[PDB]
Amino acid sequence: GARREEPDLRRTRRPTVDHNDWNVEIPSSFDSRKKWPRCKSIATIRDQSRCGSCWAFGAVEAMSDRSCIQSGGKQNVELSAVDLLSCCESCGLGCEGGILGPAWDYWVKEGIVTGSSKENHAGCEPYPFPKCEHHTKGKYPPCGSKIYKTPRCKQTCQKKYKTPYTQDKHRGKSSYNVKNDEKAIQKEIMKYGPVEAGFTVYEDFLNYKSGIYKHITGETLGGHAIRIIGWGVENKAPYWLIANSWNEDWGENGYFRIVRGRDECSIESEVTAGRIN
């Protein structure tokens, strides 16, 4: 799935922010869903389906959040995973895995159209692939091991949607990395909204049902990209609160928690976001 950007590219393509000059009280817990309750995207869990497009999902999800947050709720949109997945050439290999950083660069340079889930069939370019169960059982068919081919980049909206593809593009103004630093990540999320991040997947992650995840057993399976929405503490143990893109039947109703403050599975190493203004 998700792979790490070459460090020379990561360093040069965009700035890194740390918020060291910002002397704000950091609350012991924070949930983006609570701070911005009128931004409905923040509480929406998506499904990447049979496609290694986690990199695109973490991106368009955090971007849809930030469009609402940073406009004071004036822009309420659900950005197209398929448009980003199929059209960004510097982001990697579509359904065969991709890279986080360049997706935020792409949002700034070219922008991304609107588009809902397949089932909702709404916006310019809704997702073409159905919901399926990822490493669990539930109401959807199992994903299985087959992977869809990356769709071609189409540059046109579905028939019923009136705004032309180009004019439906929503662009960021800036993209950036966040410093590998717990307090910098917290400051970023509480001020500007959820961020995208990547982490190392071990075999025991695929058995996660509940609790604060930490890697205990099993070999590495690769990388995954997700959306960090807040943080908290349970019985003195600090965690990040994270939206996965494997639908609401996975994990804690689509979400999970993972150890915070110790770069667990490199969770604090590839944080990336950007701003609309």
Beta-bridged to residue 243, according to DSSP, are 227, 255
Please tell me which residue in 19, 39, 51, 54 is annotated as part of the active site.
54
Please tell me which residue in 51, 68, 170, 244 is annotated as part of the active site.
244
As measured in angstroms, the least distance from the Cβ of 126 to Na ion is 7
Pick between residue 1 and residue 176 the one whose CB is nearest to Na ion: 1
As measured in angstroms, the least distance from the Cβ of 46 to Na ion is 5
The number of beta carbons lying within 10 Å of the beta carbon of residue 195 is 25
As measured in angstroms, the least distance from the Cβ of 33 to Na ion is 18
Pick between residue 102 and residue 126 the one whose CB is nearest to Na ion: 126
Please tell me which residue in 132, 170, 224, 265 is annotated as part of the active site.
224
As measured in angstroms, the least distance from the Cβ of 128 to Na ion is 10
- The yes-or-no answer on residue 244 being catalytic is yes
Residues that bind Na ion (CB under 5 A): 46, 81, 117, 127
DSSP string, 196-260: EEEEEEEGGGGG--SSEE---SS-EEEEEEEEEEEEEEETTEEEEEEE-SB-TTSTBTTEEEEE-
Sign of the Cα pseudo-torsion (261, 209, 120, 90, in order): positive
DSSP label at 17?
A: E
Pick between residue 81 and residue 185 the one whose CB is nearest to Na ion: 81
Pick between residue 13 and residue 40 the one whose CB is nearest to Na ion: 40
Q: Is 229 in contact with 243 (CB distance < 8 Å)?
A: yes
DSSP label at 5?
A: P
- The yes-or-no answer on residue 253 being catalytic is no
How many C-alpha atoms does 73 have within 13 Å on its Cβ side? 6
- The yes-or-no answer on residue 51 being catalytic is no
Which positions are annotated as active-site residues?
54, 224, 244
